[PDB]
Structure formats: structure tokens, C-alpha cells
């Protein structure tokens, strides 16, 4: 019957879900649980590099809050 | 007796002419053809499960010659 | 560096499949087998090129709509597209878009 | 593990792939081509076995000769056979192709396609039923399943 | 971790292409009142694997090509570019977050014509060359409408960034304001990928260019061709059927976005089963006399419509 | 060795030019010009020009060069001089590369330097836009005269080519 | 009055695609002139602050230039919040 066509669709459907699911998880793993920063324009890049210097550890995604201010 | 297959005169009133403009621009009769193939997608296929099922035959079938005994 | 790795991986992968495709069956040993210019086609390519170039002048339109001279910008944007349509009309009427000899 | 065990299982993997994806090139010459179309029709649906309906000569694994092979046609048949990439099998369908059939004693008919190309399976009938050609195709699958190319190379 | 990311994109693409062959054979079967592969594995789930092994252990031809170096360059270029067109796709986060991603996909897509042209030369056959010339003229003709239609849509979006199309459709699909463009974009994607009713190459009784290829090299052209069918339908869904993105539950986006991308890929198989084939002179007239006049007119309309409603999108 | 990416690309740029400048068969000559075009875009991208670099792929490689190859396959009927020229070209490239990498200063018509292209890049930018994109978008606000003459020339190109190719 | 109707009703029957193309292109050239919202497009484009608003040295006679951003003097985007 027609529903015997679905199992092929499920495999094809799952294979198109892995690339999207993998990229989202790998970014969070590599960016300390946050989305990967988006820097399309020079101003955004300048802030990101500044965050690298302010973190102490040379990482753009380690955010320092008020507790870092005297 | 005989009949004509393709001897129609299409009307030239505005409503009829607009009907064929919608058909030309909005692809009405092409989508009418997609629906027919959609119906067959939900019909039970006519395939039999050979070699576990066999095609019907009749007592008059002519196959392998053979020699009989009394 | 990321975009460089992505291109390297895709084409490196394609090369591997190609060479192992021409050799894997050659690990097998099968017995050796032994033993007009068309003008209309050229005009399609040239018509595409001149149309393709005019598209190059239209790609920056989305950024061009951010200006403070919209009256001037909208006048030239419709001029380029109108001129592109004039070229199509000229070929159409001069039998350029035909495939019959 | 033994070498004779790995080769036995590798032979089963290549045989399984080859007999499960037979792509035929059909030489429809005469009435026997009609019965071959009924094997592709919904009743029997050769495609559900992996046997595609139509394949080009260079993408094909089996040649089905369905109809009468004439003397004016024989050179074309041999040329198509020589250009088939290997492995390649030939199925002879119908009395005309098997031995000439009703036109055996004609001046313009090759008496059997097996004197022009090698033949693996003969399907009798005039024409064979679409369920008789299908039985022949499944008999070619089992023949490919018995191949032992790797088990004979390992003993050379 | 980026290298792991690339492999998490490439392998699933090839697996999806492998099982698209099965799904195509079964959807076509049921629309024809039959079944399709259901013997090689349960419901034909092992049919793709059998076909792959068979092709890669079959002897290749490699005729007396005039070059023998274009014969090997053509499938590398086709498959290499086909995988490259996936790297900027937001699903919902791109592998490579390009600022001009929409323009990157046009650029890489216009290079796929060389593999069609080079394989024509390598075959060394005069007739095979004619088939390559007709295919090339088809591809370049229909990417004129891909470029202009895309420009018209981006005038309602404001950038060439692919992830900005997600923001643009945060209140409503672009299919609603731009359905006439969607129609001519959908048909233009069939012609680009040599799909029925535009498959003159595979349309025997008139010609294909990849006729001298067998075994593995043939499968490489096949894999690239089908990966482009999935990619173009993923592009269409992003462009005209935007899926809402929730930053806390990105998997929700991927499931909805995949379902749309599958439904549009099955529509390609649906259209193949329903219509006869265009003549070569007739698909050219469908572009130079019907689509192009409308595409140019709609481009004028979409340059002016945002201005006269005060609806110009932000640059950033 | 990643800091000298621009110079490495330029070296590949020249080698491609020596490829089709030696004039092998047109099929291979066009192949070498596609490689140089791709490398040429790579250089432009690393200087901050993204729209210009991509315009090379879409219009030059995917446009003109496709018409060149398309016309070659249909009107071209598919030696020591070629090899002699090709070997001569590479040697001059090697010596120019060798000297600019030894003393980092070469004088051939102009005074060239060998420190590295990175030393002349601007050190300050905090804009919320792409300076290259803003300039190209100015074609419609500032370049009114440019648009008219360019469009008219393209229109005349259509008229002229049909006149030339009619043959009667 | 009857000549135009006969002409229009014939292209609409034989060339519906071209009839649609010219109607759409014709609206792209006319409506912006008659549209009352075209003036708001320019104001929105002029209001977008890409650059820094460099301050002006105070001389004493500048009552129209605010001393602080939150003073009531200067251009106002109230019209934009309601558009
Ligand atoms: C990418 C996805 C696809 C991946 C492909 C996976 C394939 C997995 C199976 C690979 C191993 C089998 C490939 C070789 C089989 C060739 C064959 O059938 O003939 C045996 C061939 C036949 O050789 P032969 O010695 O018997 O005779 C050759 C000469 N003639 C025929 C003229 C007498 O023997 C081999 O070369 C096998 C080598 C060992 C394989 C390990
Ligand atoms: C290699 C095998 C053949 C590959 C053919 C395909 C070429 C890839 C296209 C070039 C990359 C690109 O398009 O950049 C767009 C994109 C445009 O992205 P963007 O404009 O959005 O900017 C990205 C960064 N922001 C947004 C922050 C400004 O380029 C990049 O993203 C990064 C640029 C990296 C530059 C390095 C290029 C080196 C490789 C070029 C040489 C290619 C040789 C080709 C050989 C001949 C074959 C044609
Ligand atoms: C005519 C033949 C060719 C036509 C091709 C038709 C196939 C293309 C798909 C058409 C149907 C649209 C997809 C419906 C299934 C999508 C499932 C889904 O994403 O969630 C339901 C989606 C959920 O919506 P959403 O997650 O996509 O977000 C909507 C975005 N906003 C909020 C801006 C509108 O809604 C539906 O599609 C219901 C129908
Ligand atoms: C207020 C301002 C409003 C401005 C905008 C107003 C717009 C008004 C409407 C304009 C018309 C709409 C354009 C429709 C496109 C017309 C293109 C055309 O050329 O038509 C004639 C063309 C050909 O017309 P023809 O062949 O009959 O004849 C042309 C004219 N003569 C007779 C002189 C030759 O039709 C086709 O395109 C053929 C279709 C090929 C087969 C396609 C299969 C269709 C499968 C269904 C797909 C459904 C779409 C899926 C979309 C999914 C998207 C996610
Ligand atoms: C079968 C009948 C219908 C026919 C087939 C239809 C097409 C196939 C279905 C569409 C494709 C979807 C393929 C993926 C489905 C299986 C995976 C799934 O359902 O979602 C799992 C997802 C994983 O969870 P995870 O991302 O790890 O969250 C961790 C948070 N700390 O959990 C989530 O987070 C989800 C939110
Ligand atoms: C509008 C709806 C009313 C209408 O169309 O007019 C109906 C009117 C009566 O019909 P009828 O008696 O047949 O008259 C035609 C005889 N010449 O018929 C008329 O006589 C009306 C006048 C006929 C001429 C009108 C031509 C209409 C086509 C012009 C192109 C319209 C383009 C619209 C945009 C298309 C894209 C969506
Ligand atoms: C409601 C009111 C709406 C406005 C009125 C409708 C517009 C009127 C014009 C429409 C009729 C056009 C004339 C025509 O009928 O052309 C038909 C002819 C087709 O000839 P052919 O296909 O070769 O014949 C084959 C026969 N076997 O074709 C020809 O001979 C020449 C056709 C050339 C078409 C050029 C297309 C390029 C223009 C695209 C539109 C872009 C907008 C143009 C700028 C508009 C500025 C305002
Ligand atoms: C600065 C350095 C410039 C000089 C570098 C010379 C590079 C060219 C190498 C010589 C060469 O090209 O081959 C010899 C030349 C043409 O090649 P040839 O073998 O004669 O081809 C026809 C033979 N029947 O034969 C010739 O006709 C001589 C051409 C001038 C050299
Ligand atoms: C620092 C400055 C950098 C300068 C770089 C310039 C050098 C780059 C070398 C690559 C350029 C190669 C140019 C191509 C030469 C060529 O095509 O010559 C073709 C000519 C025709 O020969 P043909 O008709 O094929 O039959 C054989 C007849 N003997 O065949 C011949 O006559 C052979 C001629 C030999 C070609 C090499 C000569 C180079 C001369 C350079 C002069 C400028 C310096
Ligand atoms: C190689 C041998 C060489 O150096 O020849 C240089 C010759 C004279 O140039 P000159 O500046 O006097 O030499 C520097 C000495 N300290 O000058 C030459 O022979 C160089 C030949 C160049 C031919 C120019 C052809 C027109 C193109 C001009 C564009 C600029 C190209 C030169 C600059 C790039 C260097 C290749
Ligand atoms: C101010 C800024 C804008 C300025 C724009 C000026 C440039 C316009 C560029 C347009 C693009 C070029 C197209 C020009 C070719 C026109 C078509 C043509 O070549 O004529 C061929 C046609 C052949 O005639 P035949 O086939 O024998 O018989 C049936 C004909 N209907 O002969 C014909 O009978 C065709 C009749 C002439 C076509 C007239 C087209 C007028 C289009 C304007 C419509 C605007 C309406 C907008 C309002 C819509 C409101 C809903
Ligand atoms: C027949 C040859 C024709 C000319 C091409 C030469 C190819 C072989 C290399 C010889 C010259 C040389 O010394 O190679 C070495 C150079 C290295 O340059 P760099 O990366 O800027 O090093 C400078 C940076 N340091 C200081 C870290 C070393 O290689 C190239 O630039 C690449 C050549 C293209 C391949
Ligand atoms: S064997 Fe019988 S059915 Fe087949 S071609 Fe001959 S006569 Fe016709």
C-alpha cells in the first residue's frame, strides 16, 4: 500500500535532519553553551576581538560581567 | 454515421476569454493532471507477489507438450 | 580557514571516489575487449552573455534602495530594466529567438 | 580467521549486489517484446525485484533478446553485446531467439541467437508468458548466486 | 570540531541521495498502480546499497577520449561543486555564515555547466557533443530567470545573507506576497537540473551527454545531480516557505524545515510522473518569450513597490 | 605560511597565465584561464572585496568563459613552440620569486618590495557596513551618466552582433 | 472607444502573458509618482544613523541645537513610531 513508501522517506528524512542538528549542537559545545557569534560587518568583529582581550582566557565567548569591575 | 472530434468554435465573450487567460497564467489544467496521479498514489496497486502468488489461468492453457498413458 | 577546509574536503573526497572508481573494478581482470557549426546555438550563448552582463549591473539594487536619493535611484533602476526589455524585443521581432531554418 | 572464510563471504556480498540490481537492456525485435512489456506492467512489476524497466547498453548487466533475429540484424546485436561492460549475461526469450521457431527454415533468419552471442538462460514459449519470463529472470538470479569468482581466484 | 562538522554534513547528504533513489522508484510505482522495490530488504530498504556496490565493481569503459583528462575532470567538478553548495545553508545555523551567501550559490551553480561541456569534449563523439551543446544552452538560459527572480525577492529582504531570509518571514511566508515569482522559480529549478518535463538529455529519442560513462564514474554524475535536486528544494523552502526559528529549541526548526524540504523534493517526483516532455525549441520559447517578459516586469514592480509603501527593509 | 596567502595565490595566478599564453590547444587554453580566474578572485577576496570577487565567478567564469568554451567546442574542430614558451615562462617566474624572497627588493621597471602584502593593510575600521558595497550601490545615485552609457553600449552590442552574424 | 476595446480584447485572448507583463511594468512606473507614502521612504532613509553625530562647538547663539540628547530641541522620530 501507499504507506509502505514511508520507511524510505523516514531514512531520507533523518539524513537531512542530522546536518542541521549537528551544527547547532557543535556550535554550542564550542562556544560555551551559547550561539556562535555572527560578525558580518567590521564593527561586530571589533567587539568580538575586544571580548577576547577582556576574557583573560583568549576566548571570545567567556563573558565578564560586573564582577570584573571595581 | 460519423461524428466530428475537433470541430468546436471557442466563444469570444469576455468571461470565456478571461477563463482561458486564467488557465494560461495559473496553469489550471496542468494542476488538474497532478490530481489524477495523486489519486493513483492512494489506490491499491495491482501487483501480485510472485512466486508466492500466480496469475490466473484456465483449463485450455497451452504449455509443455507431454505424452499420456491409458 | 574554515571556508578553505570545506572546499578542500569536498573536492578531495570527489577525487578519491573517482580514482578508486577507475581502479576498484581494475582489481578485477576482465579479458581485454579489443577494438558542423550551428549559428543558432552560438546566438543563444551570445544573447545570454549580454543579458548576463546587464544582470551584473542590477545585483547591487538592494543596497541602492538605502540611499537618500530614491527619486534618482528609482529612475535609473527602471531605466536599466526597461533597456534590458528593449533588447529582448529587438531580438524577438528580428527573428533572433527562432529555431526554424 | 581463515582466508577461505573471508573469500566465501566476500563472494556472497558481490553476488548479492549483482543479482539484486540486474539492469536489463531489452532488444525488442518482435511479438516477444510485448510480453516483456507486461512484465514491467503493474501485474508483475519487474522493478520491485530491482530489475529496472529500461537501461542503456553501457549501464546494463543483462541483454534480453526478445524476437526474431534476422540476418540483417545480427551484426547490430553482436556490436551491442561487445560494448556491454562486464559482467554481462544474455537471456534468450522465445522460440525465435532460442532456435528460430516458426521461421527456422527461412533464408533471412539466424537459427538461434546463441550462434551469434553466448546465452545464459533460454525461456521457451511463443511467446513465453510474462510470468514465464519472470521465472527465467529469477532463475538467472540464482545462477549468479552460485558464482564463485573469488573462491576460484584464491585457489590459483 | 569543525572537521567533524564537515563530515556531519557530507555523509548524511550522500545517504539522503542514496535513499532518494528508492523513494523515487516507489512513489513513481504507486502513481503507476504498482509497488516498486520491496524485495531487497524490508520495503526495499537495502535496494540503494545493492545498486552502489554493483556499480563500483563493474568494469568501466573509458573509450578513446580525445583528452582522457577532461573525462576525469568532469565528474570531480560536478560532485565537488554539488557538495559545496550546501555549506552556507542555514538549517538553521550555517556551516559557513557568509554575508553574501545567496550570491555564493548563484556563483557556484553557474560553474556546474563546465562538467556538462567537458564531458561532451571527452567523449570524442561528434553526436555526443551536440547533446552537450543543447544541455548547456538550456542551463544558461534558465539561470537568467534564477538571478532576476532572486533579486526581486531580496528587495523584500534587504540583503544577500541567507539567514536574513528567516527573519524576513517571521510574520508570514514570502509565498503570499510573491507567489507569481515562486511559480517561475520552481519551474526554473526543474530546467536547471534537467528534470522532467525538461529532461532532453535523459530524454531518449532526441539524444544524453553522459552516455559514455558506466560504473563508478556514472554514479558520480548521478550523485551530484540528485544532491542538486535536494539542495534546490531546500533553497526554495528557505526562500518562499520560511520556518520560524526559536534560539532555545533549534531542533524544532530543523524538523519543520526538513518536512518542507522533503515535500518539495517529492513534488519533483510527482511532476515527473504526470506530464510529457518538452521539445527543445519549446522550452527555449518558454524562457525567452514567457518567463523573461514577466520576470523583467515583476522586477520593475518589486523595485518600486517597497518605495511606494514605505517598506524598504533594513540593510543589516 | 598562511600570512603569505596572497603572494602564494599570485604565484599560481602567473603560472596559469603562462599556461594559456603559450597557446596550447584552445580546449586546454580555456582550462588554464579558468584556473587563473578562480585564483584571481581569491586574491581580491583577501583584500576586502567580496562582491567584486564573487562577480568574477558569476560574470567572468560562469559567464564569458562559458561562452568561450561553448564557442570553442562548436567552431574549433576538436609542439616544440608550446613547450619552449611554457618552460621559458616558468623560469622567469622562478627567478622573480627567488630574488624577491632572497633580498626582499627587486627593481624591474618599478621598485617592488618583499616584506609581505599584509604590511600595507589599514589598521582601523569600526563601520556597520561594507565600504565596497556602499561604493557599488552608488552607481544608481552618483553614476547616472555611467548607467546611461553602459546600458546603451550593451543595447548596441545586441544590435551589432545580429548584424554581423546574419551573413546576408 | 470601440477600437480600443476590440484591440484590448484580442491581445487578452492571443497574448495574455504579454498583456500581463506590460500592465505590471506600467504600474511600476506610475504608482510611485501618485503614492503619498513615497515621501516617508526618504525620511526613513535619512533617519538611519550610520555615522556618529559629531557635536558642534557651542558659541552661544544656537537655540535650535540641543545641549543633551533628551532635550526637546532637534529632529524628532515621533512620526516614525506611529507609522
Ligand atoms: C563506495 C560504495 C561502494 C563500495 C564497494 C564495496 C565493495 C565490497 C566488495 C569489494 C571486494 C570485491 C571486489 C573484487 C571482486 C571482483 C570479482 O568479482 O572477481 C574476482 C577477481 C577475478 O580474478 P580471477 O583471477 O579469478 O580471473 C581474472 C582473469 N580472468 C577472469 C580472465 C580469468 O579476482 C580478484 O581480483 C579479487 C581480488 C581480491 C579481492 C579482495
Ligand atoms: C579548490 C578546487 C576548486 C574550487 C572551485 C570553487 C572555488 C571556491 C569559491 C571561492 C571562495 C568564495 O567564493 O568566497 C566567497 C566567500 C564570501 O564570503 P563573504 O563575502 O560573506 O565574507 C565573509 C567574511 N565576512 C562576512 C565577515 C566579511 O568568501 C569567504 O567567505 C572567505 C574568503 C576566503 C578567501 C580564500 C579563497 C582561497 C581559495 C580561492 C582559490 C580558488 C581556486 C579555484 C581553482 C579554479 C577552479 C575554478
Ligand atoms: C502544486 C504541486 C506543487 C506544490 C508543492 C507543495 C509541497 C510544498 C509544501 C507545501 C505545504 C507546506 C508545508 C506543510 C508542512 C510543514 C510542517 C511545518 O513546518 O509545521 C507547520 C507549519 C508551522 O509554521 P512554521 O514553523 O513554518 O512557521 C511559520 C512562520 N510564520 C510564523 C512567520 C508564519 O505551518 C503549516 O505549514 C501548516 C500548513
Ligand atoms: C496590484 C499589482 C499586482 C502585480 C502582480 C499581478 C500578477 C498577476 C498574475 C500574473 C500572472 C502570474 C504569473 C504566473 C506564471 C506564468 C508563467 C507563464 O509563462 O505561463 C505561460 C506558460 C506557457 O504558456 P503557453 O505555452 O500556454 O502559451 C504561451 C503564449 N502563446 C500561446 C503565444 C505561445 O505556462 C508555463 O509555464 C508552462 C508550465 C510548464 C509545466 C509546469 C508544471 C507545473 C507543475 C505545477 C507547479 C505548481 C507551482 C509550484 C510552486 C511551488 C512554489 C513553492
Ligand atoms: C513516520 C511517519 C511520517 C513520515 C516521515 C516524515 C518525515 C521524517 C520526519 C522529519 C525528519 C525528522 C528526523 C528527526 C526525527 C528524530 C529526531 C527527533 O525527533 O528529535 C530529537 C531531538 C533531539 O534532542 P536534542 O537536540 O539532543 O536536545 C538536547 C537538549 N539538551 O529532540 C528535540 O529536541 C526535538 C525538539
Ligand atoms: C472586468 C469585468 C467586466 C468585463 O470584463 O466586461 C464585460 C463585458 C461584457 O462581456 P461581452 O459582452 O463579451 O463584451 C466583450 C465584447 N467585445 O465585456 C466588455 O466588453 C468589457 C470591455 C472589453 C475590453 C476589455 C479588455 C480586458 C482585457 C484588458 C487586459 C486586462 C489586464 C488585467 C491584468 C492581467 C493580470 C492579472
Ligand atoms: C489593461 C491594459 C494593459 C496594457 C495593454 C496590454 C499591452 C498591449 C501589448 C500586448 C500585445 C503585444 C503585441 C503582440 O501581440 O505580440 C505578439 C507577437 C508574437 O509573435 P510570435 O510569437 O512570434 O508568433 C508565433 C505564431 N506562430 O510578439 C511580437 O511580435 C513582439 C513582442 C515583443 C514583446 C517584447 C517583450 C519585452 C517587454 C517585456 C515587458 C517589460 C515592460 C516593458 C516596459 C514597459 C514600460 C511601461
Ligand atoms: C628571453 C629568452 C627568449 C628565448 C627563449 C627561447 C624559447 C623558445 C624555445 C625554442 C622553440 O620554441 O623551439 C624551436 C623553435 C620553434 O619550435 P620548432 O621545433 O622549430 O617547431 C617546428 C619544428 N618543425 O624554432 C624556431 O623557429 C626558433 C624561434 C625563435 C626561438
Ligand atoms: C620581467 C619581464 C617578464 C617578461 C615575461 C615574458 C616572457 C614570458 C614567457 C611566456 C610567454 C610566451 C608567449 C608565447 C610565444 C608564442 O606563442 O610563440 C609562438 C611562435 C609561433 O610558432 P608556430 O606558429 O607555432 O610554429 C613554429 C614556428 N617556429 O613560436 C615561436 O616563434 C617561438 C618563440 C618562443 C616563445 C618564447 C619567447 C619569449 C620572448 C619574450 C620577449 C619579452 C621579454
Ligand atoms: C628581465 C631583465 C630586465 O631586468 O630587463 C629590464 C628592462 C629595463 O628596465 P630597467 O628598469 O632599466 O631594469 C632595471 C635595472 N636596475 O625592461 C624590460 O625588459 C622589462 C620588459 C617589460 C615589457 C613591458 C611591456 C608593456 C607592459 C608594461 C606594464 C609594466 C610591466 C613591467 C613592470 C612589471 C615587471 C614585469
Ligand atoms: C515613461 C517611462 C517609460 C517609457 C517606456 C518606453 C519604452 C517601452 C519599452 C517596451 C519594451 C519594448 C517593446 C516594444 C515592442 C512593442 C511590441 C511590438 O513590437 O509590436 C509587435 C506587434 C505585432 O503586431 P501583430 O502580431 O501583427 O498583430 C497583433 C499585435 N497586437 O505590433 C503591435 O500591434 C503591438 C502594439 C504596440 C505595443 C504597445 C505597448 C505599450 C505598452 C504600454 C502599456 C502601459 C499600460 C500601463 C497601465 C496598466 C494599468 C492596468
Ligand atoms: C618552475 C617553478 C616556477 C615558479 C614556481 C615555484 C614553485 C617551487 C618553489 C620555488 C620557489 C621558492 O622558493 O618556493 C618557496 C615559496 C614560499 O613563498 P612564501 O610562502 O611567500 O614564503 C615566504 C614566507 N617564509 C618566510 C615563511 C618562508 O613558494 C611559494 O611562494 C609558492 C609557489 C607556488 C607553488
Ligand atoms: S517466439 Fe513467437 S511471440 Fe516471440 S517473436 Fe517469435 S513468433 Fe513472435
Automatic annotation (TrEMBL), chain C:
GO cellular component, one term: mitochondrial inner membrane
Class of the enzyme per the UniProt entry, highest EC level: translocase
GO biological process, alphabetically ordered: mitochondrial electron transport, NADH to ubiquinone
Recorded superkingdom: Eukaryota
Transmembrane annotation, as ranges: 41-61, 73-90
Keyword vocabulary terms for this entry: Electron transport, Membrane, Mitochondrion, Mitochondrion inner membrane, NAD, Oxidoreductase, Respiratory chain, Translocase, Transmembrane, Transmembrane helix, Transport, Ubiquinone
InterPro entries: NADH_UbQ/plastoQ_OxRdtase_su3 (IPR000440), NDAH_ubi_oxred_su3_sf (IPR038430)
EC identifiers of the protein: 7.1.1.2
Catalysed reaction equations from the record: a ubiquinone + NADH + 5 H(+)(in) = a ubiquinol + NAD(+) + 4 H(+)(out)
Membrane topology: Multi-pass membrane protein
Gene Ontology terms, MF aspect: NADH dehydrogenase (ubiquinone) activity; oxidoreductase activity
A Pfam family of this chain: Oxidored_q4
Compartment(s): Mitochondrion inner membrane; Mitochondrion membrane
Family the UniProt entry places it in: Belongs to the complex I subunit 3 family.
Entry function: Core subunit of the mitochondrial membrane respiratory chain NADH dehydrogenase (Complex I) which catalyzes electron transfer from NADH through the respiratory chain, using ubiquinone as an electron acceptor. Essential for the catalytic activity of complex I.
Subunit structure: Core subunit of respiratory chain NADH dehydrogenase (Complex I) which is composed of 45 different subunits. Interacts with TMEM186. Interacts with TMEM242.
Name of the protein in its database record: NADH-ubiquinone oxidoreductase chain 3
Annotated source species: Bos taurus
Gene: ND3
Amino acid at each position: 500500500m501507499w504507506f509502505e513508501v514511508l520507511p524510505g522517506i523516514a531514512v531520507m528524512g533523518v539524513c537531512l535532519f542530522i546536518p542541521g542538528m549537528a551544527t547547532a549542537r557543535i556550535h554550542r559545545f564550542s562556544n560555551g553553551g551559547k550561539e556562535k557569534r555572527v560578525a558580518h560587518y567590521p564593527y561586530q568583529w571589533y567587539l568580538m576581538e575586544r571580548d577576547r582581550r577582556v576574557s583573560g582566557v583568549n576566548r571570545s565567548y567567556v563573558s565578564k560581567g560586573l564582577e570584573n569591575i571595581d | 454515421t460519423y461524428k466530428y472530434v475537433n470541430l468546436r468554435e471557442p466563444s469570444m465573450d469576455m468571461k470565456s476569454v478571461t477563463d482561458r487567460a486564467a488557465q494560461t497564467l495559473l496553469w489550471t489544467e496542468l494542476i488538474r493532471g497532478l490530481g489524477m496521479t495523486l489519486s493513483y498514489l492512494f489506490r491499491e496497486p495491482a501487483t501480485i507477489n510472485y512466486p508466492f502468488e500466480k496469475g490466473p489461468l484456465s483449463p485450455r492453457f497451452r504449455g509443455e507438450h507431454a505424452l499420456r498413458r491409458y | 580557514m574554515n571556508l578553505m577546509l570545506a572546499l578542500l574536503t569536498n573536492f578531495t573526497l570527489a577525487t578519491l571516489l573517482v580514482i578508486i572508481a577507475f581502479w576498484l573494478p581494475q582489481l578485477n581482470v576482465y579479458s581485454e575487449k579489443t577494438s558542423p557549426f550551428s549559428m543558432k546555438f552560438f546566438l543563444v550563448a551570445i544573447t545570454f552573455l549580454l543579458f548576463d552582463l546587464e544582470i551584473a549591473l542590477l545585483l547591487p539594487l538592494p543596497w541602492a534602495s538605502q540611499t537618500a536619493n530614491l527619486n534618482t535611484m528609482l529612475t535609473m533602476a527602471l531605466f536599466l530594466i526597461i533597456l534590458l526589455a528593449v533588447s529582448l524585443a529587438y531580438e524577438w521581432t528580428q527573428k533572433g529567438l527562432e529555431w526554424t531554418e | 580467521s581463515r582466508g577461505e572464510y573471508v573469500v566465501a563471504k566476500l563472494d556472497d556480498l558481490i553476488n548479492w549486489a549483482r543479482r539484486s540490481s540486474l539492469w536489463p537492456m531489452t532488444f525488442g525485435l518482435a511479438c516477444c517484446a510485448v510480453e516483456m512489456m507486461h512484465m514491467a506492467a503493474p501485474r508483475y512489476d519487474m522493478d520491485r525485484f530491482g530489475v529496472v524497466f529500461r537501461a542503456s547498453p553501457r549501464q546494463s548487466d543483462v541483454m534480453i533478446v526478445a524476437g526474431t533475429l534476422t540476418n540483417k540484424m545480427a551484426p547490430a546485436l553482436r556490436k551491442v553485446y561487445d560494448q556491454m561492460p562486464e559482467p554481462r549475461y544474455v537471456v534468450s526469450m522465445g522460440s525465435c531467439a532460442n532456435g528460430g521457431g516458426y521461421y527456422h527454415y527461412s533464408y533471412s533468419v539466424v537459427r538461434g541467437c546463441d550462434r551469434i552471442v553466448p546465452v545464459d538462460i533460454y525461456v521457451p514459449g511463443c511467446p513465453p508468458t510474462a510470468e514465464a519470463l519472470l521465472y527465467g529472470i529469477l532463475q538467472l538470479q540464482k545462477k549468479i548466486k552460485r558464482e564463485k569468482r573469488l573462491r576460484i581466484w584464491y585457489r590459483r | 570540531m569543525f572537521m567533524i562538522n564537515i563530515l556531519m554534513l557530507i555523509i548524511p547528504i550522500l545517504l539522503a541521495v542514496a535513499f532518494l533513489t528508492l523513494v523515487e522508484r516507489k512513489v513513481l510505482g504507486y502513481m503507476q498502480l504498482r509497488k516498486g522495490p520491496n524485495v531487497v530488504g524490508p520495503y526495499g530498504l537495502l535496494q540503494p546499497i545493492a545498486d552502489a556496490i554493483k556499480l563500483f565493481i563493474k568494469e568501466p569503459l573509458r573509450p578513446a577520449t580525445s583528452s582522457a583528462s577532461m573525462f576525469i575532470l568532469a565528474p570531480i567538478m560536478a560532485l565537488g561543486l554539488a557538495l559545496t553548495m550546501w555549506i552556507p545553508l542555514p538549517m538553521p545555523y550555517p556551516l559557513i555564515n557568509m554575508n553574501l551567501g545567496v550570491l555564493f550559490m548563484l556563483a557556484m551553480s553557474s560553474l556546474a555547466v563546465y562538467s556538462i561541456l567537458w564531458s561532451g569534449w571527452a567523449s570524442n563523439s561528434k553526436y555526443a557533443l551536440i547533446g552537450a551543446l543543447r544541455a548547456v544552452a538550456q542551463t544558461i538560459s534558465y539561470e537568467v530567470t534564477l538571478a532576476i527572480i532572486l533579486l526581486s525577492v531580496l528587495l523584500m529582504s534587504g540583503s544577500f545573507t541567507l539567514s536574513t531570509l528567516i527573519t524576513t518571514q517571521e510574520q508570514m511566508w514570502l509565498i503570499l506576497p510573491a507567489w507569481p515569482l515562486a511559480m517561475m522559480w520552481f519551474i526554473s529549478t526543474l530546467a536547471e537540473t534537467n528534470r522532467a518535463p525538461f529532461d532532453l538529455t535523459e530524454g531518449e529519442s532526441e539524444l544524453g551527454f553522459n552516455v559514455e560513462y558506466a560504473a563508478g564514474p556514472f554514479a558520480l554524475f548521478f550523485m551530484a545531480e540528485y544532491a542538486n535536486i535536494i539542495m534546490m528544494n531546500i533553497f526554495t523552502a528557505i526562500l518562499f516557505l520560511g520556518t520560524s526559528h526559536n534560539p532555545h529549541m533549534p531542533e524544532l526548526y530543523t524538523i519543520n524545515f526538513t518536512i518542507k524540504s522533503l515535500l518539495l523534493t517529492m513534488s519533483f517526483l510527482w511532476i515527473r510522473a504526470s506530464y510529457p516532455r518538452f521539445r527543445y525549441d519549446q522550452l527555449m520559447h518558454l524562457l525567452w518569450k514567457n518567463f523573461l517578459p514577466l520576470t523583467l516586469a515583476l522586477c520593475m514592480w518589486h523595485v518600486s513597490l517597497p518605495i511606494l509603501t514605505s517598506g524598504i527593509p533594513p540593510q543589516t | 605560511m598562511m600570512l603569505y596567502i596572497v603572494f602564494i595565490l599570485s604565484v599560481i595566478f602567473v603560472m596559469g597565465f603562462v599556461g594559456f599564453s603559450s597557446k596550447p590547444s584552445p580546449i586546454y587554453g580555456g582550462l588554464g584561464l579558468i584556473v587563473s580566474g578562480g585564483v584571481g578572485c581569491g586574491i581580491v577576496l583577501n583584500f576586502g572585496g567580496s562582491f567584486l570577487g564573487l562577480m568574477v565567478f558569476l560574470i567572468y567564469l560562469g559567464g564569458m568563459m562559458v561562452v568561450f568554451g561553448y564557442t570553442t567546442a562548436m567552431a574549433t574542430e576538436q609542439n616544440k613552440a608550446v613547450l619552449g614558451a611554457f618552460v621559458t615562462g616558468l623560469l622567469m617566474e622562478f627567478f622573480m620569486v627567488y630574488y624577491v624572497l632572497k633580498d626582499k627588493e627587486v627593481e624591474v621597471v618599478f621598485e617592488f618590495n618583499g616584506l609581505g602584502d599584509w604590511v600595507i593593510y589599514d589598521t582601523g575600521d569600526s563601520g556597520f557596513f561594507s565600504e565596497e558595497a556602499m561604493g557599488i550601490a552608488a552607481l544608481y545615485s552618483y553614476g547616472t551618466w555611467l548607467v546611461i552609457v553602459t546600458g546603451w553600449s550593451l543595447l548596441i552590442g545586441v544590435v551589432v552582433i545580429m548584424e554581423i552574424t546574419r551573413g546576408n | 472607444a470601440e477600437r480600443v476595446a476590440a484591440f484590448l480584447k484580442n491581445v487578452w485572448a492571443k497574448e495574455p502573458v504579454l498583456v500581463a507583463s506590460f500592465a505590471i511594468a506600467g504600474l511600476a512606473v506610475i504608482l510611485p509618482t501618485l503614492s503619498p507614502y513615497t515621501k516617508y521612504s526618504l525620511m526613513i532613509n535619512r533617519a538611519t544613523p550610520y555615522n556618529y553625530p559629531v557635536p558642534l562647538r557651542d558659541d552661544g547663539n544656537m537655540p535650535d541645537v540641543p545641549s543633551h540628547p533628551q532635550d526637546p530641541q532637534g529632529p524628532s522620530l515621533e512620526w516614525l513610531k506611529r507609522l
